[PDB]
């Protein structure tokens, strides 16, 4: 259905109390809004709206939200998005370790 994606929800750097929803091993480090949008697009989700606000200032320096429509539930959608981002980054780096 339609739901919002907040980068913290799939960020492996974070604890669950602080917002991570996705299992630790599936989550990716510092998911960027642009990465989430591209992942959603590759998964053929419909991107409704993207908001990104960067303000000169700590943890509130960056704000980002993506409104998506997916054929799947939010939890499954988030897992697929996280996996797609990992795949993206690996493709670009072309290497496993630094």
Author numbering: 2 to 58, 65 to 105
Q: Which sentences from the paper describe this structure?
A:
As SRP binds to signal sequences emerging from the ribosomes, the resulting complex composed of the SRP and the ribosome-nascent chain complex is then targeted towards the membrane through the GTP-dependent interaction with the membrane-associated SRP receptor (SR also named FtsY in bacteria). We describe the X-ray structures of SRP54 and SRP19 the two protein constituting the proteinaceous core of the SRP from the hyperthermophilic archaeon Pyrococcus furiosus. SRP54 and SRP19 constitute the conserved core in all archaeal and eukaryotic SRPs.
We solved two distinct crystal forms of Pfu-SRP19. Two molecules of SRP19 associate in a dimer with an extended β-sheet surface built around the anti-parallel association of their respective β2 strands. Observation of the crystal packing in the orthorhombic subunit reveals a tetrameric arrangement between symmetry-related molecules that is similar to the one observed in the monoclinic form. Pfu-SRP19 is characterized by a more extended β-sheet due to longer β2 and β3 strands when compared with all other available SRP19 structures. The structure is also characterized by two loops (L1 and L2). In contrast the L1 loop remains structurally unchanged, this is observed even when all available structures of free and RNA-bound SRP19 from different species are compared.
